[PDB]
Design a protein around this nucleic acid. Structure first.
Lengths: 130, 141, 36, 127, 198, 173, 125
RNA sequence: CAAGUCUGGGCUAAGUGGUAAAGGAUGUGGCGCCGCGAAGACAGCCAGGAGGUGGCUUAGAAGCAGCCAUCCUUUAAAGA
């Protein structure tokens, strides 16, 4: 059986595009509002991406397979990862701290990230939004 | 129902249900078939009950192939008479069927349908039956 | 309830053997069977 | 005395009667169930076609309501002499009329939702 | 398609079958040798291969021969093979059975009704350099009566049919509303060919 | 199986014979039968159970045996519980002594003396909880109570487990 | 011919003495014409709190009916339908059981129409 | 009731053995040969399961009466 295949091929390209992957937990509200943080965070991020919400334990074995070195401060959990490798991001996360932070019982959480290429912390990133 | 239109002889001897099938044993037309696991005289009314149940199940659609044909006369003496006085009158007609005979065969329907239809029909038969698809039945040469 | 071919009727229906013999039970009680 | 609401009704064009579902859901609203028949002013233009609506109440016992666009199967029936066919542009015209609703904000995508609704009513798309 | 095959001397075809081995034979104008194969390995291959595609026979020595199956003899009771005749190919226009691929939706199935694939093979003369797979067949014209056949089929180069043609290869045919006229019918009265004087 | 390793807490002694296994603790002691086809004896900070072979007899008794234990261990650190709703008009429950007097529309109220090891509460007058060390006993008495006036079957009458019922949407009528 | 009730809804085209001939002609035409029994159908509108609608309608269908529609009237809800007069016996008390005595209904002759091929034999009787 | 409570390996748990068929069945043991599994659902469990919203008939058929068609959208993934 396949030990990391056509799903790595898409994640280790769409996330081997640049060096600013930002990681989040996003599954926990009605998809009306979910398919409108993802169609809405196109108003702050480029190409055609808000998140790739794909398999941790395949997001894990790609950030290592493609040299990009551990996002392993939060690589566990329900990991959605707002890929800003194909994006126009810096304060695009600044415009991602309202619509699912101050909206729900905490709808979209930060977790781990890459600033240019060296690794951005959790609260030193979360607070970086304001 | 189903019975010869003409005949040289009106009554025939009972004979035997022997091995084999002789022929009739690979599919040939449809995608699925119903094969006989035991010998038996299959009556015209059995074949018909079967065929009809077959069509109820695919209400419009599909084709049914009836590969057996009852051309053997079933005799039975009048009720409560004795032995002798000659051979009984024909009560009906049977098709002789030995193990491995493909009896029915359907096509033009889903697997779900043919399975289900052939199961029903085979419930109308006096014998154990198996259903089949199309393997080594490419029995051209 | 009591007959010779005991089959599952619905999806929730559950074949069980017990006290010797084969039962069925769906959540819907009409489907409750026993061989006999 | 009733509490708050975000009512998601679904009323057609013209016949606006306080009859349910404009009764059980809008009895906790104090809703002007006749300040809708506001509607046939904006849809005195159109004429037909259902118009979705969301009526929200507050504390002082006042109401509100914003409406979406008419069924995707509507504009397609008139654009074919139906109760026919539409070109690769006449599909790209309609996907504009409902682009602030569907989900996509494209037309290579949006049009296909319309082109899909083509075989939903048996109406070929002129190529 | 490969298939480990072996050589049979002169000992009782019952045993092999009993073992697990489908007894058989390869032959052609030149050759003729008794051989068995694994029944279980032979079934895996012959289900995809059928008589249509070439099966290669790897003997003990390493000699891989391409072969077509000419004949598989069944058991009747148990739809089960008893024997294979392997035809060993050479430099030859050989006669063989090539799949038709009925591709298209016939306009007479869309109109209710059924495609009866009379023939799923046609018998062709052809040299083993060019064994086609499919011979795909234009179907989509056929309305719920008419029935294309013979050579109304595109034949790739050097391929040429050793049938008639005329031999019918496909009909589309009519498919519960007629079970009343059927049940009613209850007619005829079986007639005995008059023997006798006259 | 669910032959994981169990987990002995605070003040539980876990004795062990060839056929049995005693479990002491803050809420009491319990004797727990066991197939001698498994070999458990008073084990570490946690109790573990193996089986000789992987026959079907065996696998079955495993887990069966681990659970029997485990329920015993939870019994003795407070494993009482499971409560009864009585639903419907005149129906209500009170304690008379330790014994339990349900009025449920029969002509006289029924009383239910609680067996050994088992205690009845009646917080509300229509909620009722059965409390014991054992477990299978709690279950048994739970059911005897329930079966005094079972639900439903056309109404929201009778006495229920907390964990809820269908109604048969019947002849109004 | 069948039960002996009036014959209706037919066009005769002609192409003491005269009397006996029409009388024996048509008497026969109706047999050769291969007849069918018609039976009164009442237009019914029943009025029910909406609670009960499904069961009410279900029972109308069970009465061999054909529902025609449903509007409100004030606090409750009306259902219009056609049902054969025959199956409408004791309707009011069946209805009252299905509506906890809150339903009412009214009934007016509407048309005649042929039967369900079950009766007739069970009506030549 | 004369001679093995003989030896080695299986099966059976019904007193089957020690009375019967179609048929039914997580009985049990064994042989297959296909899937799935460091692209960590097998089972439980926590989420999601959504847009276009469907054509027809029918009083009403809107994923679910029964008939034609199974076409896209945003997707992690959601069947007309």
């Amino acid at each position: 059986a396949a030990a990391a295949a056509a799903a790595a091929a898409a994640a280790a390209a769409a996330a081997a595009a640049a060096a600013a992957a930002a990681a989040a937990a996003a599954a926990a509200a009605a998809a009306a509002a979910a398919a409108a943080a993802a169609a809405a965070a196109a108003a702050a991020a480029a190409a055609a991406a808000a998140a790739a919400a794909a398999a941790a334990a395949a997001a894990a074995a790609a950030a290592a397979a493609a040299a990009a070195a551990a996002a392993a401060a939060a690589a566990a959990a329900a990991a959605a990862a707002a890929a800003a490798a194909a994006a126009a991001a810096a304060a695009a996360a600044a415009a991602a701290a309202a619509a699912a932070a101050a909206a729900a019982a905490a709808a979209a959480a930060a977790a781990a990230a890459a600033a240019a290429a060296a690794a951005a912390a959790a609260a030193a990133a979360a607070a970086a939004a304001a | 129902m189903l019975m010869p239109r003409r005949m040289k002889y009106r009554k025939q001897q009972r004979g035997r249900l022997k091995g084999a099938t002789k022929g009739g044993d690979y599919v040939a037309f449809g995608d699925y078939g119903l094969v006989a696991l035991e010998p038996a005289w299959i009556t015209a009314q059995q074949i018909e009950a079967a065929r009809v149940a077959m069509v109820r199940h695919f209400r419009r659609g599909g084709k049914i192939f009836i590969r057996i044909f009852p051309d053997k006369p079933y005799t039975k003496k009048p009720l409560e008479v004795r032995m002798g006085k000659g051979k009984g009158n024909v009560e009906g007609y049977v098709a002789v069927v030995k193990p491995g005979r493909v009896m029915f065969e359907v096509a033009g329907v889903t697997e779900e349908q043919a399975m289900e239809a052939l199961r029903i029909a085979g419930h109308k038969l006096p014998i154990k039956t198996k259903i089949v698809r199309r393997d080594a039945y490419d029995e051209a040469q | 309830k009591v007959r010779a071919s005991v089959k599952r009727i619905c999806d929730k229906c559950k074949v069980i053997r017990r006290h010797g013999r084969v039962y069925v039970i769906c959540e819907n009680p009409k489907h409750k069977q026993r061989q006999g | 005395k009733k509490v708050v609401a975000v009512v998601k009704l679904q009323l057609p064009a013209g016949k606006a009667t306080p009859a349910p579902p404009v009764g059980p859901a809008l009895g906790q609203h104090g809703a002007n169930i006749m300040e809708f028949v506001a509607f046939n002013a904006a849809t005195a233009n159109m004429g037909d076609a259902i118009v979705p609506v969301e009526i929200t109440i507050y504390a002082d016992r006042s109401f509100t309501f914003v409406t979406k666009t008419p069924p995707a199967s509507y504009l397609i029936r008139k654009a074919a002499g139906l109760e026919g066919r539409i070109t690769w542009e006449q599909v790209l015209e309609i996907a504009k009329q409902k682009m602030p609703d569907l989900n996509t904000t494209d037309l290579e995508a949006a049009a296909r939702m319309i082109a899909g609704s083509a075989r939903s009513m048996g109406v070929e798309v002129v190529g | 398609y490969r298939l480990k095959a072996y050589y049979r001397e002169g000992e009782k075809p019952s045993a092999l079958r009993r073992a697990g081995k489908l007894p058989g034979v390869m032959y052609n104008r030149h050759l003729n040798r008794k051989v068995y194969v694994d029944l279980v390995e032979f079934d895996k291959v012959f289900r995809q291969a059928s008589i249509h595609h070439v099966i290669v026979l790897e003997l003990p020595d390493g000699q891989s021969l391409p072969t077509l199956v000419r004949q598989v003899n069944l058991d009747k009771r148990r739809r089960r093979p008893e024997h294979v005749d392997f035809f060993v190919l050479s430099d030859e226009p050989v006669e063989m059975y090539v799949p038709l691929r009925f591709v298209g939706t016939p306009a007479g199935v869309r109109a209710g009704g059924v495609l009866q694939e009379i023939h799923r093979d046609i018998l062709v003369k052809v040299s083993p350099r060019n064994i086609p797979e499919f011979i795909e067949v234009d179907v989509s014209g056929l309305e719920i009566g008419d029935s294309l056949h013979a050579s109304d089929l595109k034949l790739p180069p050097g391929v040429e049919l050793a049938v008639s043609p005329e031999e019918t290869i496909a009909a589309v045919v009519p498919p519960v509303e007629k079970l009343a006229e059927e049940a009613a019918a209850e007619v005829a009265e079986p007639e005995v060919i008059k023997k006798g004087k006259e | 199986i669910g032959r994981l390793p169990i987990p002995v807490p605070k003040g539980v002694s876990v004795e062990v014979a060839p056929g049995r296994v005693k479990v002491k603790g803050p809420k009491g002691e319990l004797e727990v039968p066991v197939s001698p086809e498994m070999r458990v004896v008073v084990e570490e900070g946690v109790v573990r159970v193996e089986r000789p072979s992987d026959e079907r007899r065996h696998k079955s008794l495993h887990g069966l045996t681990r659970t029997l234990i485990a329920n015993a261990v939870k019994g003795v650190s407070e494993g009482y519980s499971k409560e009864l709703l009585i639903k419907g008009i005149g129906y209500r429950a009170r304690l008379v002594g330790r014994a339990l007097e349900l009025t449920v529309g029969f002509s006289h109220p029924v009383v239910v003396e609680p067996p050994e090891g088992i205690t009845f509460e009646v917080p509300e007058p229509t909620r009722v909880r059965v409390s014991g060390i054992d477990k299978q006993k709690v279950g048994q008495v739970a059911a005897n109570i329930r079966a005094i006036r079972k639900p439903s079957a056309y109404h929201e009458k009778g006495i229920y487990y907390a964990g809820e019922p269908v109604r048969l949407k019947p002849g109004k009528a | 011919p069948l039960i002996g009730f009036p014959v209706v809804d037919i066009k005769v085209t002609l192409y003491m003495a005269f009397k006996i001939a029409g009388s024996m002609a048509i008497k026969e035409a109706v047999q050769k014409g291969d007849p069918v029994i018609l039976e009164p159908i009442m237009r019914v509108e029943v009025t029910t709190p909406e609670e009960y609608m499904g069961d009410v309608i279900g029972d109308l269908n069970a009465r061999r009916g054909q529902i025609l529609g449903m509007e409100p009237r004030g606090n409750a809800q009306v259902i219009r339908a056609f049902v054969p007069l025959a199956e409408m016996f004791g309707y009011a008390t069946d209805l009252r059981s299905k509506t906890q005595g809150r339903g009412s209904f009214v009934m007016f002759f509407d048309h005649y129409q042929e039967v369900p091929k079950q009766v007739q034999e069970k009506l030549i009787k």
